Subunit: 665 residues, 2 copies
């Protein structure tokens, strides 16, 4: 149809006279906390169902085919998870059995408190890398060597193989307990807005840098070299230079085997990902490559005849729960917070992906509480921080997963691989385990291809991606996230400090106002200069507003007034002996403002007062209701600054100006 209206000019006062405002509701803090405190059995049952979602999806099971689906998904996910755990155990500097421990107990703890259906709780390469880094920083290698072995010249201060692993495991357990406590605190206190600051480019750059560091560490492990656990500033660059300098002390057989298995795994993964229409079930390349590696390494004595690197330290059993060593929280609080927030971000991302893929809901605070309880239970049984790997979750989702029972069955695989099975993997080379991690880095390595796409998009988002990726390499990985979130907040502040001000004008015989820098055939008011200023004025962009006004009016309210004062005294001395030509008004279209920051309303009133002395009216166009109600309490409407200065719409101000010019010459 059409758009035509006719109404009087309600600027500020002609609107609030015949409009009865809605009185605010009574606070009544006592009755508010009393009424909010629920006591009926309905709320109790609701909070019990929410806190314990196990009683929700259990009674409505579909056992008929879900039994077979869950058993096959469980055996597959159990194999994949025990392989990923025995691989990531090297990233946390812990023995190979504690990876299987952290692949068994967290699943059982998440089965009774989780809210997802496809999330495979277990180890994670980035989290394991951060745990290993903080363990090396808190317990380096040169702090355990004991002089023994009747050395030639000095005391034989060889490696501390033995009690060193116990100290590392205790440190990892304390770290896991602290991370679980932090997650439970963040969950119970309903403080979940802290993880919203992890932007998509920020987390992308962080994952890219973490994958690069994981590649460096796994290359160090494959080459079988001995570094000095460089940590701190430029740790990755220093250890990479050391690797490049320590090439001579490598193992040719281990390097050849690692390169071969890397090529094979990458080729098989690419073939399975590309030609999916011919093979429905993904081929477990990890399982078959581990089997063939154990078979080849058992035929010939690869440990003695080839001097390879194997585990051969699997006791094939459990251990009683050990009390955590409390007291190391003050020196690892920041590291635990970083690990917890990155693990929660990755878990929420994986959950949202595999939930929008399967069309079900996943609660954030419930996942936080579940991961907290899982890490707390893991800290009592010598396990590290658990998360959900994108590669491990993909297997359970591709093989067909409906409920967490497949995860419970996935624990049975690790269960039988801990009690009796497990000692058969004795001659397995450590390079094979250190290779699948590199093969799983293809997902995060291909994330760099977004920079050419983000650069064509909003450039400020691309700068955050490059800055987060680079800064998370210089000053380590744990402190790199803190340097990324602060940089993102500073970039947000810069976008609200430097707005996009224009010369908004009206199309001929219209009422909508568009910018003048993007159109040609626009008419401007005779004398009046319209201005729009987004990014609401606060204490940091008030000088920007001053400069924008001075640029859009052509002059300055200070210099013109000083010139007028200088010309006035020349008149009073001449009688004793014997600029602002085009500018008529200023309509500020501050319609994109949210807050006002009274520190800035002071300068706004100062501007209004200064422009009044030079006989230049400064009006407003589209101020919001809440903004005006806030400015009223900030001392802005004095006996001279009435409400007639403000307006409701932009066209009403121009109409009032035209009417005043026509009725008053």
């Amino acid at each position: 149809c059409s758009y035509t209206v006719s109404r009087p000019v309600y600027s500020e006062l002609a609107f609030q006279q015949q409009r009865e405002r809605r009185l605010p509701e009574r606070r009544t803090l006592r009755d508010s906390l009393a009424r909010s405190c629920s006591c009926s059995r309905k709320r109790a049952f609701g909070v019990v169902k929410t806190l314990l979602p196990i009683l929700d999806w259990l009674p409505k099971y579909r056992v008929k085919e879900w039994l077979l689906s869950d058993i096959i998904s469980g055996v597959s996910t159990g194999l994949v998870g025990t392989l990923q755990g025995m691989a990531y155990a090297l990233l946390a500097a812990v023995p190979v059995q504690f990876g299987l421990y952290s692949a068994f107990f967290p699943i059982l703890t998440y089965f009774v408190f989780g809210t997802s259906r496809h999330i495979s709780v277990g180890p994670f390469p980035v989290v394991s890398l951060m745990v290993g880094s903080v363990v090396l920083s808190m317990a380096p290698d040169d702090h355990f060597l004991v002089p023994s072995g009747n050395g030639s010249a000095l005391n034989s201060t060889t490696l501390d193989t033995g009690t060193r692993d116990a100290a590392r495991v205790l440190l990892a357990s304390t770290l896991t307990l602290l991370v679980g406590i932090i997650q439970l605190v963040f969950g119970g206190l309903q403080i979940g807005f802290i993880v919203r600051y992890l932007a998509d480019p920020l987390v992308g750059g962080f994952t890219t840098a973490a994958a690069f560091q994981v590649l460096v560490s796994q290359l160090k492990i494959v080459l079988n070299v001995s570094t000095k656990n460089y940590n701190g500033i430029l740790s990755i660059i220093y250890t990479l230079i050391e690797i490049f300098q320590n090439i001579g002390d490598t193992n040719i057989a281990d390097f050849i085997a690692g390169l071969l298995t890397i090529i094979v795994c990458m080729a098989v993964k690419e073939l399975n990902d590309r030609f999916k229409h011919r093979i429905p079930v993904p081929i477990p390349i990890e399982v078959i490559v581990t089997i063939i590696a154990t078979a080849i390494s058992y035929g010939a004595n690869l440990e003695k005849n080839y001097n390879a690197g194997i585990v051969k330290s699997i006791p094939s059993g459990f251990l009683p729960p050990v009390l955590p060593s409390v007291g190391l929280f003050s020196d690892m609080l920041a590291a635990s917070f970083s690990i917890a927030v990155v693990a929660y971000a990755i878990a929420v991302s994986v959950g949202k992906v595999y939930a929008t893929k399967h069309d079900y809901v996943i609660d954030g605070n419930q996942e936080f509480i579940a991961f907290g309880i899982s890490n707390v239970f893991s800290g009592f049984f010598s396990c590290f921080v658990a998360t959900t790997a994108l590669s491990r979750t993909a297997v359970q989702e591709s093989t067909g997963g409906k409920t967490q029972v497949a995860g419970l069955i996935s624990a049975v695989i690790v269960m039988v691989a801990i009690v009796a099975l497990g000692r058969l993997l004795e001659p397995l080379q450590k390079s094979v385990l250190a290779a699948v991690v590199i093969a799983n880095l293809k997902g995060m390595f291909m994330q760099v291809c977004d920079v050419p796409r983000l650069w064509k998009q909003n450039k400020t988002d691309a700068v955050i991606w490059v800055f987060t990726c680079i800064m998370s390499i210089i000053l380590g990985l744990d402190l790199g996230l803190l340097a990324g979130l602060l940089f993102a907040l500073l970039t947000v502040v810069l976008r609200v400090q430097f707005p996009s001000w224009n010369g908004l004008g009206s199309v001929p015989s219209t009422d909508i106002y568009k910018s003048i820098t993007h159109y040609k055939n626009l008419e401007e008011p005779e004398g009046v200069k319209i201005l729009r200023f987004s990014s609401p004025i606060f204490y940091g962009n008030v000088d920007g507003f001053k400069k924008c006004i001075n640029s859009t009016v052509g002059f300055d309210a200070i210099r013109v007034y000083n010139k007028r004062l200088k010309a006035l005294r020349r008149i009073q001395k001449l009688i004793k002996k014997g600029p602002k030509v085009p500018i008529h008004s200023l309509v500020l279209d501050c319609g994109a403002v949210s807050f006002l920051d009274v520190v800035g309303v002071r300068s706004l009133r100062m501007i209004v007062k200064e422009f009044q002395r030079i006989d230049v009216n400064v009006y407003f166009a589209l101020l919001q209701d809440d903004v005006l109600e806030k400015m009223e309490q900030c001392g802005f409407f004095d006996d001279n600054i009435r409400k007639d200065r403000f307006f409701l719409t932009v066209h009403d101000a121009i109409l009032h100006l035209q009417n005043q010019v026509k009725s008053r010459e």
Copy 2:
């Protein structure tokens, strides 16, 4: 007065098909790099005028209330400057001989370069300990430690003199020169936007604990309490509890002397404020309480007979300029960066606190080079850093003062006190001059009255004021402003993340759309609702914008889709076996107050459109004026079905679009 604005409804594609755009100027620097100042002499004369802020106020002052007002004010702040030079020099581990030079030379170069009134350039208490910290670290206390003097058992390892303090002054002079060139090189690239981040409650909440810091720093000297030096965390608390713990060895004669003077000085001060219409020129009680204190001390021997504490160490005569050591600038460079930042922070914080009572807003670029070259001119003469004390800037502004000439005449008082008036203020009890700063300190102690005032105006800045106050007490004045600077910026990102979102509704027989939570007797279109987030959709408020929709529409687009397919599969098996949706048709997001968008916002906003599209409920938008519109189409928002037709220029066009469609 009505007006006819009859115009067909214009969407985005319906407005660009008949109009024309303007070719955006890329403005490449390959040929436009010489457009600032090529040959025009007008731009060259402008930067020289701003470089020398002496040709602005000096050829413009009025001598009516200038001569007598600044002279009585200059001697007031000049006396305080002499006492600070005699006290802060001892804290910097250097001999107390150049303290008067730090108040004379920097003022001369700052009198011409620098436009910031009510500021007395000189030493600052918290910046003197930073200079003394790097001296004791990079220079041992005993350089030679000559073991001579025929002691009791072993050789008398007496501390070497003469050459020890000489290297201490040389090291301190090199640091001031290194800070000066670092302060000057910052003005090269013109980083003047850092001062814009200092809000009035930020500088107000900073110069209230510093007023408490300068109070406890002047309380230990007015009571003669030998306390240790404390810096870092809990610095103000540790010094306060030390005075209360070591209050025993307190000079009773000096206590009653300062207590009697602090009362009479503030009583006449408020008396002048009451009788300001009777006496035109304010009576300079500072020089009055000074001459009577030296009289009662010289005539009674308060030092050798009462132990009251006097200066008795006033130097005499200037010294020729000495060249510094350039080869030592490398070691001092690692520590001078921390001192140079905190020096400029306190320097401009005391300039903005007085910008609220007088319209004298200053610029950061000019003050960065003003204090920069002043410390350079302070260099080569074995002077101190070119900071500004909080006590001297209070005694100059409260007791008269019009321009910076009061600092120039104050240096003249220091110039005559070093060459000819050394023996005059010899028996000065160091109490009437150390407590006179507390009288003028009421101008900053009474600044806490804005907390109940700002609380009723805006709750956010009221918390910012009290946060910087309590944080500067614990973390000291060094980290107090730094932590408050990030906290002030944190309130900006929080107010933009959690806005006052409300559903809008039109007024009857009109096209004005306002919030329905603040009005009554409104109406809402049957099946069409309005939502105005009034905040940009960045990576932080992504889920907040989602929670704003599901809480306003009544239902949740996520839970109604899975239950729909669940019921669809439930009724599907019943056909083979044998056989809470709100009537709201669509929603129009009135996201017109958005100023910027990011990649996370345009991706999440696309998911919202695809989410409601599956529930047979359309989603429309509102005015995207110039930037938030072109950024969406650039980030890949329109692929096959989503087009610019769903947007609207005005909010009423969105309601009229859904009206005639049905």
